Coordinates of N, CA and C and ligand atoms in Angstrom, one line a residue:
Chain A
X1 N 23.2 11.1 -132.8 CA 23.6 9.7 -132.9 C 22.4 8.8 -132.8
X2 N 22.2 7.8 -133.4 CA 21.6 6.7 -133.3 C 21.8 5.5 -132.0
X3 N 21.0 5.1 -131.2 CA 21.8 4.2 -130.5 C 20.3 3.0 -130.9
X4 N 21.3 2.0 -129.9 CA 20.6 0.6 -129.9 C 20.3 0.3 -128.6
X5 N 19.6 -0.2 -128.2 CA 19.0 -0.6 -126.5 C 18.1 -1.8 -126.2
X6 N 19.1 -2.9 -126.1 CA 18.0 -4.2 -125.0 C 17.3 -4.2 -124.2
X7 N 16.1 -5.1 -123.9 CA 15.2 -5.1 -123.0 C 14.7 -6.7 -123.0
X8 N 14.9 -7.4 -121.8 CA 14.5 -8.2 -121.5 C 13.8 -9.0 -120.5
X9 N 12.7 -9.3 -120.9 CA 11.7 -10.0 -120.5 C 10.7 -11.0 -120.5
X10 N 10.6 -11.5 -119.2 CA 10.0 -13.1 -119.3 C 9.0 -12.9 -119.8
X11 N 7.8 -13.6 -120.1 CA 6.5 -14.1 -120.5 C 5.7 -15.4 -119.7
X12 N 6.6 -16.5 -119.9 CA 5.7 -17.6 -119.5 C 7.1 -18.3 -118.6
X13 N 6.3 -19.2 -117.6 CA 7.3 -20.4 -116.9 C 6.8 -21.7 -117.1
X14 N 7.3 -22.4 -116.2 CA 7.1 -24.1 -116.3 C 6.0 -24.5 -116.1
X15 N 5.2 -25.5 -116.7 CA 4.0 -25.9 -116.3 C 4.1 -27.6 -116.2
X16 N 3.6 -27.6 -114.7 CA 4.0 -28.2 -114.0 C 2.9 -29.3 -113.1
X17 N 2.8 -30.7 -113.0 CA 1.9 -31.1 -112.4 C 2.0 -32.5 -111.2
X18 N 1.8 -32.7 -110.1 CA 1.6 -33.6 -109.1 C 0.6 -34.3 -109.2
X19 N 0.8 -35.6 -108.4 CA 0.5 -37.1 -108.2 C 0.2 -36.8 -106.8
X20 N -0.7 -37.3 -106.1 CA -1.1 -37.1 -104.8 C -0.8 -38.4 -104.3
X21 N -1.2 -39.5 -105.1 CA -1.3 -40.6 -104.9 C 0.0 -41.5 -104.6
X22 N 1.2 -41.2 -105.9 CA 2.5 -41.6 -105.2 C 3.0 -40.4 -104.5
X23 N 3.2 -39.2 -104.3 CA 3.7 -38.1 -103.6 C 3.6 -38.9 -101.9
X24 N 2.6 -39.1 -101.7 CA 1.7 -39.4 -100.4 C 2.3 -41.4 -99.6
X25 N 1.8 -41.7 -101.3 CA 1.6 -43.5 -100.5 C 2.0 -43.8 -102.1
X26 N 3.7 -43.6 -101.7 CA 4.2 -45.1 -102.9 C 4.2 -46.0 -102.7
X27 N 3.5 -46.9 -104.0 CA 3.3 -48.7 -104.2 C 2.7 -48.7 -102.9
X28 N 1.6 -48.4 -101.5 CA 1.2 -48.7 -100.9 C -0.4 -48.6 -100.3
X29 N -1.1 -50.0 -100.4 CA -2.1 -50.1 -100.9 C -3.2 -49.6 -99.4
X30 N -2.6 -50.1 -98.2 CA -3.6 -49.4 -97.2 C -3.0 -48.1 -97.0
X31 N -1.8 -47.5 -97.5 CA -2.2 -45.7 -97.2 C -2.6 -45.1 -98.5
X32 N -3.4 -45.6 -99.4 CA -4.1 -45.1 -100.2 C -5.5 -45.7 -100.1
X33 N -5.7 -46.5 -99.2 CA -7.2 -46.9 -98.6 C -7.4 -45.5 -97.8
X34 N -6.2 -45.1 -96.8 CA -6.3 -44.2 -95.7 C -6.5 -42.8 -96.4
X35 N -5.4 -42.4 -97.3 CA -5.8 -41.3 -98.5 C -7.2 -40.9 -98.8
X36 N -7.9 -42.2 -99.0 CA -9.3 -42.2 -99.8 C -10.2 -41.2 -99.2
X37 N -9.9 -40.6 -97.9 CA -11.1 -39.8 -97.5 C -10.9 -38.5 -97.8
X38 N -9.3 -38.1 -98.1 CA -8.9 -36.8 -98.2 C -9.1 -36.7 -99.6
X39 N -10.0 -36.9 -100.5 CA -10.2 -36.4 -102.1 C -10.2 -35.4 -102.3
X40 N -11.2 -34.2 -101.9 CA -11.0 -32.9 -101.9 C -10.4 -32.2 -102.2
X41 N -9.8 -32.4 -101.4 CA -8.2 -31.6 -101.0 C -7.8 -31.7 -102.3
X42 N -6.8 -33.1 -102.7 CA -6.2 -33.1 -103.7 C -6.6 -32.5 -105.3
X43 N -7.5 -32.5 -105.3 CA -8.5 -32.2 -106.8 C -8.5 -30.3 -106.6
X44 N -8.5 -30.5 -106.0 CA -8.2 -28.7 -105.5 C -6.9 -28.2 -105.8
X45 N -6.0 -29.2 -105.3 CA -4.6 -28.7 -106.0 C -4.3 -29.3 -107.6
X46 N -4.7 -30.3 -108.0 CA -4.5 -30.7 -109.5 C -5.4 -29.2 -110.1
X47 N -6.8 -28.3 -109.6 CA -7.2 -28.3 -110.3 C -6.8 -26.5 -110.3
X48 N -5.9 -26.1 -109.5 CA -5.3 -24.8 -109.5 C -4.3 -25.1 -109.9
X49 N -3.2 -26.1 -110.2 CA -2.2 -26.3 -111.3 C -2.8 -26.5 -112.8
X50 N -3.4 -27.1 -112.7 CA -4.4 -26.7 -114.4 C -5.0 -25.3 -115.1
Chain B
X1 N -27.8 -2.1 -109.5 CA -27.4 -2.0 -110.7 C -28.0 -1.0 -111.6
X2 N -29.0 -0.7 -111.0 CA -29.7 0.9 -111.1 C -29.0 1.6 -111.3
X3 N -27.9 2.2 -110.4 CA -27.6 3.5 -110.1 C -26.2 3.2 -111.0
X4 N -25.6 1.8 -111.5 CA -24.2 1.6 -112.3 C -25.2 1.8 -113.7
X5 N -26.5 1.7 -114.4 CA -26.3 1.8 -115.3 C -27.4 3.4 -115.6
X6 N -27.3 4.2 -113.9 CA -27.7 5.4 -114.4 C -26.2 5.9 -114.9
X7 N -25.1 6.0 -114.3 CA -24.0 6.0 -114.5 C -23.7 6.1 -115.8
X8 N -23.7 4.7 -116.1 CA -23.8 4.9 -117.8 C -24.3 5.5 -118.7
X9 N -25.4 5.2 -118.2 CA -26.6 6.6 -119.1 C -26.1 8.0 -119.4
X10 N -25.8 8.3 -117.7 CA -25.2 9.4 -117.7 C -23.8 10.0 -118.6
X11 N -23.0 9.0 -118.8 CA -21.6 9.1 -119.4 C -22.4 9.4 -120.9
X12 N -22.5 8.0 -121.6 CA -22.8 8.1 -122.7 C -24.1 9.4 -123.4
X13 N -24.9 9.6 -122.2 CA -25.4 11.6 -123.1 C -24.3 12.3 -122.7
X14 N -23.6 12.5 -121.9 CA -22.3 13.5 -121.7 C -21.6 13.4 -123.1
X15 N -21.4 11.9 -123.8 CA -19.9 11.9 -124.7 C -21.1 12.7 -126.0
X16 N -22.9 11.9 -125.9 CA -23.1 12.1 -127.0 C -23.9 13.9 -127.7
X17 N -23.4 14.3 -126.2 CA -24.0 16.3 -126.3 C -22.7 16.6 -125.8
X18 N -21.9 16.9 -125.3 CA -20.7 17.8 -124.8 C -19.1 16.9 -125.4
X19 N -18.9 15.9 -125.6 CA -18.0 14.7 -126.6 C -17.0 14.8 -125.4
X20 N -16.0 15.5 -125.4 CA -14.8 15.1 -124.3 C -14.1 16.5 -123.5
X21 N -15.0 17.2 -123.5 CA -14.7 18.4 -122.9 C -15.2 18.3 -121.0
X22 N -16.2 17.1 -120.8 CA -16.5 17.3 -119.5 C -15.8 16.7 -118.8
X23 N -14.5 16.0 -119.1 CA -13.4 15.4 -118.3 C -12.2 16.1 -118.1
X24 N -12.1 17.3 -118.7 CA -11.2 18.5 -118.5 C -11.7 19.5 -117.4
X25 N -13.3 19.4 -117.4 CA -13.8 20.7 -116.7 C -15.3 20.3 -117.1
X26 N -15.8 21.9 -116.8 CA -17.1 22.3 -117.3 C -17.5 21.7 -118.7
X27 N -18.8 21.0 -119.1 CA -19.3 20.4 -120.3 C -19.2 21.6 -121.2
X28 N -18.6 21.6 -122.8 CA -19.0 22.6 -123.6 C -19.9 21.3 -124.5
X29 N -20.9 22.3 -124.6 CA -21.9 21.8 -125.6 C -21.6 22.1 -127.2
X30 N -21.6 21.1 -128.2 CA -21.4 20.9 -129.5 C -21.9 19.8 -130.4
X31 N -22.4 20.3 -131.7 CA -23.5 19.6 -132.5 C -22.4 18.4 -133.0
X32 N -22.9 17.6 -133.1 CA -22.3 15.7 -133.1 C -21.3 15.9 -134.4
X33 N -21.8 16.5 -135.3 CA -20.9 17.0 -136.5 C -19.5 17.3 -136.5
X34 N -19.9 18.3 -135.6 CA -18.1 19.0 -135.2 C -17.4 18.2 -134.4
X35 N -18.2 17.7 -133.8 CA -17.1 16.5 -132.9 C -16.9 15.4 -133.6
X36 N -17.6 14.8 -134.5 CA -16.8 13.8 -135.3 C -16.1 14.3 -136.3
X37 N -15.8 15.8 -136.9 CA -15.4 16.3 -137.7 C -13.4 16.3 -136.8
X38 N -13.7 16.6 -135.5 CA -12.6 16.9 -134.6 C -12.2 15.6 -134.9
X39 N -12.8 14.9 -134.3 CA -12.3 12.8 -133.8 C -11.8 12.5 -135.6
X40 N -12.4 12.9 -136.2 CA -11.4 12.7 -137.9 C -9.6 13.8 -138.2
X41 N -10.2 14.5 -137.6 CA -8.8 15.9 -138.1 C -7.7 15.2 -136.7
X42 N -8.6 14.1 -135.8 CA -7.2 14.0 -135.1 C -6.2 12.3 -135.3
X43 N -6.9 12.1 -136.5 CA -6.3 10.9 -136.8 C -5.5 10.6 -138.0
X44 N -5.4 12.1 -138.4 CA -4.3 12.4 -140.0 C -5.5 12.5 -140.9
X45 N -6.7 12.7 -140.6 CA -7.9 12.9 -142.0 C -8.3 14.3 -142.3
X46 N -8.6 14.8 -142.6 CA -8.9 16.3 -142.7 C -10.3 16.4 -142.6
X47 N -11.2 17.5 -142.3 CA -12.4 17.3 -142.1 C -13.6 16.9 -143.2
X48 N -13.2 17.7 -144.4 CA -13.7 17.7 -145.5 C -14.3 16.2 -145.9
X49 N -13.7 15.0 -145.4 CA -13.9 13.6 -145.8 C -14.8 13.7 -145.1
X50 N -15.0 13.7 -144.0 CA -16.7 13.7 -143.2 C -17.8 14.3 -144.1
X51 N -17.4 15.6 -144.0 CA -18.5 16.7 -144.6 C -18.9 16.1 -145.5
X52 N -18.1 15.2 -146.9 CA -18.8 15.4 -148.0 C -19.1 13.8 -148.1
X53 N -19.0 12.6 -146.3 CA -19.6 11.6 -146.9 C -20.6 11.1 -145.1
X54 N -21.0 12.2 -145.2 CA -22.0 12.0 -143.7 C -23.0 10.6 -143.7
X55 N -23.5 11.2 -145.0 CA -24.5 10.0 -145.4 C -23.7 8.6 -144.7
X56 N -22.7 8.3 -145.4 CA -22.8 6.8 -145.8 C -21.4 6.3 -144.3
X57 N -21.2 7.5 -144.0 CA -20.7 7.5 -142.4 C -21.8 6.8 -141.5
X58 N -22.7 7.5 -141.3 CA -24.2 8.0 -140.6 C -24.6 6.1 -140.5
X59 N -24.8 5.5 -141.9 CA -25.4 4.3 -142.2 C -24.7 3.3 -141.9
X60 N -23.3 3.3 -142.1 CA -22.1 2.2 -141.3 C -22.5 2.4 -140.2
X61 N -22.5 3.8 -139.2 CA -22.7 3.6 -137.8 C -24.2 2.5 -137.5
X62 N -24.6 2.8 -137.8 CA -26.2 2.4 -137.5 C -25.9 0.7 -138.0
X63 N -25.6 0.1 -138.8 CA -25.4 -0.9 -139.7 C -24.6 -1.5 -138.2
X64 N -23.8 -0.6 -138.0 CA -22.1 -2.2 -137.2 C -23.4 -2.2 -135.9
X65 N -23.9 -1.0 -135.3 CA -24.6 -0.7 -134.1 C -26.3 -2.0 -133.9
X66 N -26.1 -2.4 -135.4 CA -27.0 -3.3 -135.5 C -26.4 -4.8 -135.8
X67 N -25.2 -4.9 -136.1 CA -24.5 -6.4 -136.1 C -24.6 -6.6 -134.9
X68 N -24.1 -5.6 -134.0 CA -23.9 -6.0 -132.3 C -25.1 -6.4 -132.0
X69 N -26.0 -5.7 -131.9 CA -27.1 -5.7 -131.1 C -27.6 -7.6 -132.2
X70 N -27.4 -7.9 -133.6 CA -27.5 -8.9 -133.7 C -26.9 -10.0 -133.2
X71 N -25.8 -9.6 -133.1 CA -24.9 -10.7 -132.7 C -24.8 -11.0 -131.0
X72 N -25.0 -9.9 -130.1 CA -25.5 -10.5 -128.8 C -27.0 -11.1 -128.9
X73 N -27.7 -11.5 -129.7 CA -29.0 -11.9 -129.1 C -29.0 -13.3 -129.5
X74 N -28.0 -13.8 -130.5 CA -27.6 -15.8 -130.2 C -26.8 -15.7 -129.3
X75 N -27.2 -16.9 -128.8 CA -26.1 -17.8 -127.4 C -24.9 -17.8 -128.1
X76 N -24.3 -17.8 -127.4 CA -22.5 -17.6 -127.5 C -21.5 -17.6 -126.6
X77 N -20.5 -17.1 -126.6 CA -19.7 -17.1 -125.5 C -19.2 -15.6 -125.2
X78 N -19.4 -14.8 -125.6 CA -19.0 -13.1 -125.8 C -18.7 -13.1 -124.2
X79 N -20.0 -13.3 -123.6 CA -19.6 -12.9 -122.0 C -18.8 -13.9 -121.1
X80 N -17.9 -15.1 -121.9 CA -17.7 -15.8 -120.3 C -16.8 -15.8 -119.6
X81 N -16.1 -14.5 -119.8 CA -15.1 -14.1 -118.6 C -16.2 -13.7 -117.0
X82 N -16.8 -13.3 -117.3 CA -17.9 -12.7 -116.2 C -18.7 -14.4 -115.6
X83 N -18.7 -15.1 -116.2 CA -19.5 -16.7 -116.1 C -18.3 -17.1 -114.6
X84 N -16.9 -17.2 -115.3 CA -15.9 -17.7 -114.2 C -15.9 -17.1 -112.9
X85 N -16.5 -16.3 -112.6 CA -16.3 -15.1 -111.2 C -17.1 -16.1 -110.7
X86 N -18.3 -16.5 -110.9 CA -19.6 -17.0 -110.1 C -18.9 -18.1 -110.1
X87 N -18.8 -18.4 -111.4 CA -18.4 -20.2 -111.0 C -17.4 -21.0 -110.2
X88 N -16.3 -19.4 -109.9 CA -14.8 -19.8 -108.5 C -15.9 -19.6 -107.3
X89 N -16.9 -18.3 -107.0 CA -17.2 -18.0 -105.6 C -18.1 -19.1 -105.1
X90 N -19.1 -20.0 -105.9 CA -19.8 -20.9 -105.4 C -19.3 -22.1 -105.6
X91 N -18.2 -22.3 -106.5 CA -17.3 -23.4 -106.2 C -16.8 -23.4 -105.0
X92 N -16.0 -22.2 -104.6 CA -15.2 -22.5 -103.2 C -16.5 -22.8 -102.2
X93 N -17.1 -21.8 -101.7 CA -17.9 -22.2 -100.8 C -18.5 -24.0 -101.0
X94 N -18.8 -24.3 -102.1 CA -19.5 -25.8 -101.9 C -18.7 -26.9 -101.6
X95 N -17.0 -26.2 -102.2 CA -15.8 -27.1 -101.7 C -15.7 -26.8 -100.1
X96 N -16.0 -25.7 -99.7 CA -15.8 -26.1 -97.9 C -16.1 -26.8 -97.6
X97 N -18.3 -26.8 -97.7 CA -19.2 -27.2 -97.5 C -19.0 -29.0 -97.1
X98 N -18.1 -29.5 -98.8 CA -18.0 -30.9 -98.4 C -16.6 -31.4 -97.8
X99 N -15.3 -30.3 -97.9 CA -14.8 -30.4 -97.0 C -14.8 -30.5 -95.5
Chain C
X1 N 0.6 18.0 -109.0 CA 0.6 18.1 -110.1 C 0.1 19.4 -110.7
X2 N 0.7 20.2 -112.2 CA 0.2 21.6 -112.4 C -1.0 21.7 -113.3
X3 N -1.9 21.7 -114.0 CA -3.0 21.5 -114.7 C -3.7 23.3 -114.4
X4 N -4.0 23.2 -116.1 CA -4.8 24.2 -116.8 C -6.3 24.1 -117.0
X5 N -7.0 24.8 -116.0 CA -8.7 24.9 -116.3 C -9.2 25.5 -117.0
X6 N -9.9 25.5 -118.0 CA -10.5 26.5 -118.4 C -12.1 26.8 -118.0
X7 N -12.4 27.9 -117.9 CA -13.3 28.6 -117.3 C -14.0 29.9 -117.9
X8 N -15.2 30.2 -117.6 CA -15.9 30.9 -118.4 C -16.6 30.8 -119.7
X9 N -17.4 30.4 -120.1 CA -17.9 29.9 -120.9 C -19.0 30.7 -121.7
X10 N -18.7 31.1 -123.1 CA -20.1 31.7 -123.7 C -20.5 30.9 -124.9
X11 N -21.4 31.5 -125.2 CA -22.5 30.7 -126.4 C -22.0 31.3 -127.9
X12 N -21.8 30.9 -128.8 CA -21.7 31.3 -130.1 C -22.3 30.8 -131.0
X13 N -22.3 31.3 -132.5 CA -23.8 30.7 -133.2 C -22.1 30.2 -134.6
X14 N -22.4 29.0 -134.8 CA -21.1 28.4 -135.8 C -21.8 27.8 -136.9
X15 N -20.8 27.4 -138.0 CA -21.5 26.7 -139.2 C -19.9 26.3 -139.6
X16 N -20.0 25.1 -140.1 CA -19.4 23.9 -141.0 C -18.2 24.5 -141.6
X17 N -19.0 25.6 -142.8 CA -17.9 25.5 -143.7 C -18.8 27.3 -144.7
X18 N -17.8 28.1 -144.9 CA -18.5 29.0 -145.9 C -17.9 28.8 -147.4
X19 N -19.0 29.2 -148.2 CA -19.1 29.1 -149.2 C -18.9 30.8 -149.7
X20 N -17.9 30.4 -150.9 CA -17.5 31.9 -151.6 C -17.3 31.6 -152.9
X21 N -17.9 32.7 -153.9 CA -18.1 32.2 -155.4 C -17.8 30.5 -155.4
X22 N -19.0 30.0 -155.0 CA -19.1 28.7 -155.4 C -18.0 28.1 -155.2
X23 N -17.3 27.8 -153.6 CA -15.9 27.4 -153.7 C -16.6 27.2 -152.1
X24 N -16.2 26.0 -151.3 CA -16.3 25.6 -150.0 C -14.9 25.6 -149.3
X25 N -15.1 26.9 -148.2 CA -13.7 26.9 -147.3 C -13.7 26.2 -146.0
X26 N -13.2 25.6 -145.7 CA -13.1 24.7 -144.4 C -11.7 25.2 -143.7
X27 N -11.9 25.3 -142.1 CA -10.8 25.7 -141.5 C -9.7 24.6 -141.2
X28 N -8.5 25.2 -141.6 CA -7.8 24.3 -140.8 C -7.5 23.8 -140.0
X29 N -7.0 24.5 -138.4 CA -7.5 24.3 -137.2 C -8.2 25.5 -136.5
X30 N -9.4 25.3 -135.5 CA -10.0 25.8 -134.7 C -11.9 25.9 -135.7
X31 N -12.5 26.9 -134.9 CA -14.2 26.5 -135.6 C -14.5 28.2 -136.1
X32 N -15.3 28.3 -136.7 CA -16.2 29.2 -137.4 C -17.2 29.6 -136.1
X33 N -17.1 31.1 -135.7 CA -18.1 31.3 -134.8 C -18.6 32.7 -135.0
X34 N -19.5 33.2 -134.6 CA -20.5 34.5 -135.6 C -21.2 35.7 -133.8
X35 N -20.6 36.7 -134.1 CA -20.6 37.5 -132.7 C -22.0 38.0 -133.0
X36 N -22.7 38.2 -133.6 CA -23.5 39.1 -134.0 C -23.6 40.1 -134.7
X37 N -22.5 40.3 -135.9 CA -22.2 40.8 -137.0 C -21.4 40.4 -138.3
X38 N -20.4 39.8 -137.9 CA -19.8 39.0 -138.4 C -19.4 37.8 -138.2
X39 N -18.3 37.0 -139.5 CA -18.2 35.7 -139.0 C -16.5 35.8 -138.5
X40 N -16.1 34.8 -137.5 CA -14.7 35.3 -137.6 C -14.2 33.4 -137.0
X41 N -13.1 32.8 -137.1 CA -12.2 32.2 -136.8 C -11.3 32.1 -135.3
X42 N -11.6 30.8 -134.5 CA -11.0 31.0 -133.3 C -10.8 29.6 -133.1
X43 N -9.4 29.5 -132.0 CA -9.2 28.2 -131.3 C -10.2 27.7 -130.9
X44 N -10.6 26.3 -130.4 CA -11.4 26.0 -129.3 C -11.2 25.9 -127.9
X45 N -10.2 26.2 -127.6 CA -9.8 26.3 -125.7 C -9.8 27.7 -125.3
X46 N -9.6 28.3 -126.7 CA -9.8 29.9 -125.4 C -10.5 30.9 -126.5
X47 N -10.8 32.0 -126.6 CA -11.4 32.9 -127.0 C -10.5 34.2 -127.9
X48 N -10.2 33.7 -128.9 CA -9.3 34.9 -129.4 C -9.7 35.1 -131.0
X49 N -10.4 36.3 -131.2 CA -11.2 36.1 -132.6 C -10.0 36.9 -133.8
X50 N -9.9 35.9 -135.0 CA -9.1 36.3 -136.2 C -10.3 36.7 -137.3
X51 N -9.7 37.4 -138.0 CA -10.1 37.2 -139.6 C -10.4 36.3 -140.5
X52 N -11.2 36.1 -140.8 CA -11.4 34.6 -141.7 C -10.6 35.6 -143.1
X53 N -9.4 35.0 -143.0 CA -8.4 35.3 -144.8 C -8.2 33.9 -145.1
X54 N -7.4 33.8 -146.4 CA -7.4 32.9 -147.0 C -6.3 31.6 -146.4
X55 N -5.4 32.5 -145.4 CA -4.1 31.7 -144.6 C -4.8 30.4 -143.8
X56 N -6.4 31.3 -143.6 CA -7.1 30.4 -141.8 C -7.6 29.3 -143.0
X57 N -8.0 29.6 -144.0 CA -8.7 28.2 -144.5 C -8.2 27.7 -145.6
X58 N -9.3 26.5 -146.1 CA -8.3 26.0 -147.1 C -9.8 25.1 -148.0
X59 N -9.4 25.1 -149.2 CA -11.2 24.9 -150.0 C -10.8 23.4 -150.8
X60 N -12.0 22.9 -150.7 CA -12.6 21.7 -151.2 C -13.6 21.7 -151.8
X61 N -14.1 21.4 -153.1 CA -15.2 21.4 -153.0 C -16.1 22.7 -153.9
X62 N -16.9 22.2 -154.3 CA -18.1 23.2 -154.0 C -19.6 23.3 -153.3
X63 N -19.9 24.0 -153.3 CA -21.3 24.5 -152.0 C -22.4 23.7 -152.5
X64 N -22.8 22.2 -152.8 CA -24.0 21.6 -153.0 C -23.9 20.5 -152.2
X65 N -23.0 20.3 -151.2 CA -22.7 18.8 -150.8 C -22.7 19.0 -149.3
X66 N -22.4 20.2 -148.8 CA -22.3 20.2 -147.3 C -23.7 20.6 -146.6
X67 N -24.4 20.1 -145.6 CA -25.2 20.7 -144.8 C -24.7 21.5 -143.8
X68 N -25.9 22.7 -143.7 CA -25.5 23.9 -143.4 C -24.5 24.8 -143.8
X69 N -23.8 25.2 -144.5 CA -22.8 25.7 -145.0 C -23.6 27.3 -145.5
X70 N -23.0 28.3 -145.2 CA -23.6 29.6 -145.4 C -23.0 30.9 -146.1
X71 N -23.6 31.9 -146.6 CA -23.3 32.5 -147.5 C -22.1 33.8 -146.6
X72 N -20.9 33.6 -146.6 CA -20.2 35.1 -146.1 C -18.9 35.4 -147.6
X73 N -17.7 36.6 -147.0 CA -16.8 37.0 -147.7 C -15.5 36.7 -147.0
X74 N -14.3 36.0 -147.9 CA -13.1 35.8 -147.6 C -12.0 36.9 -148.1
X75 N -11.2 37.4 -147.1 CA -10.3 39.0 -147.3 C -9.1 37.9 -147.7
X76 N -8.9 38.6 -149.0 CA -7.4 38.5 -149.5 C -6.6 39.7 -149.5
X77 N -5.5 39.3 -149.0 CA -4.6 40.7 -148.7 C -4.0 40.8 -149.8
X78 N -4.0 40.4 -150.8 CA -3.8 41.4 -152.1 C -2.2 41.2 -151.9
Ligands
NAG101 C1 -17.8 41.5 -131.7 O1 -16.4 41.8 -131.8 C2 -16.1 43.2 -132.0 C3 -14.6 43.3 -132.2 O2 -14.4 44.2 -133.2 C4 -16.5 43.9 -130.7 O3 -16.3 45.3 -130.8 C5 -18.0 43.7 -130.4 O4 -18.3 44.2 -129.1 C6 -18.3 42.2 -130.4 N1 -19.8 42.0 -130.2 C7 -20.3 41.8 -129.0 C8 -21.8 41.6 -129.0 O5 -19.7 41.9 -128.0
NAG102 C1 -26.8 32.4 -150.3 O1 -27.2 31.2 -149.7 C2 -28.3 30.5 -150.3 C3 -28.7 29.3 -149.5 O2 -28.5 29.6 -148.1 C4 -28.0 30.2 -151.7 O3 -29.2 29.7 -152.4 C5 -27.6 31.4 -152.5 O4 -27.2 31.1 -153.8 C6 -26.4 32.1 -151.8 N1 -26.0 33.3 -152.4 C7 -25.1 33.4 -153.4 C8 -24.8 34.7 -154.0 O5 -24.5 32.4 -153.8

């Protein structure tokens, strides 16, 4: 006999990216004064989602 | 890096005097002929096509063995999966640093 | 796991391909190896010497094109 047989499998997912800036301090202008020291950090996570 | 590219040394005279017998066992020794004559009969070719075109086999090898050796000696990018290793380990460290 | 070694190892003196009335025989599988009197036909994993007849090989050719190729006799069983 001949048969037939499915297989299924993923490849790729969502790609996906964050704002530190509103995530942190929406529309607010001294907790993004207070933010300003933590740069680092953030650019570390934009730059392992990229 | 000495001893990884005696290593290599060592592999490549093994494949180019004994061909694939010394990963079974003991090296059998065989003239380069018969082993490319084998590496043809095992790919649906019969031997006879070698035999009767060694020549111009012989000159392709040496020819492609010389594009490479041409074509790594311009700048390029061939190697820059090996570039990113350095460039994550001294990233992170300089990211602590100003962390 | 079960695995087959092979072991013991000797030296034999081989060639390419023989040449018979001007007609080039090449084997079809296994190599050409010469005991010290004759030439005869064997696998390469183990040691079992045949007759070079016309069954073991099979011809291409004639004898001006191959290096090393040498002068013996092929038995036809008639
Ligand atoms: C060659 O093979 C023959 C088989 O007929 C054997 O009698 C002889 O001993 C072999 N030669 C040597 C040197 O062992
Ligand atoms: C025997 O071999 C030689 C070369 O090895 C060749 O010149 C000669 O013609 C051969 N003998 C016969 C009868 O073909």
């Amino acid at each position: 006999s001949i048969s037939i047989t499915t297989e299924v499998m993923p490849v790729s997912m969502a790609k996906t990216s964050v704002d530190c800036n509103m995530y942190i301090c929406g529309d607010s202008t001294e907790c993004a004064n207070l933010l300003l020291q933590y740069g680092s950090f953030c650019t570390q996570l934009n730059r392992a989602l990229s | 890096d000495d001893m990884i590219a005696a290593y290599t040394a060592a592999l490549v005279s093994g494949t180019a005097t004994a061909g694939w017998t010394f990963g079974a066992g003991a090296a059998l020794q065989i003239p380069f002929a018969m082993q490319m004559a084998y590496r043809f009969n095992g790919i649906g070719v019969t031997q006879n096509v070698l035999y009767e075109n060694q020549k111009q086999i012989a000159n392709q090898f040496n020819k492609a063995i010389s594009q490479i050796q041409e074509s790594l000696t311009t700048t390029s990018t061939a190697l820059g999966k090996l570039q990113d290793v350095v460039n994550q380990n001294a990233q992170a460290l300089n990211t602590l640093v100003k962390q | 796991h079960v695995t087959y070694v092979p072991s013991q190892e000797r030296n034999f003196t081989t060639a390419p391909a023989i040449c018979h009335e001007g007609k080039a025989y090449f084997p079809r599988e296994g190599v050409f190896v010469f005991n010290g009197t004759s030439w005869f036909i064997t696998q390469r994993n183990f040691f079992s010497p045949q007759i070079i007849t016309t069954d073991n090989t099979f011809v291409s050719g004639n004898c001006d094109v191959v290096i090393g190729i040498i002068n013996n006799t092929v038995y036809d069983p008639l």
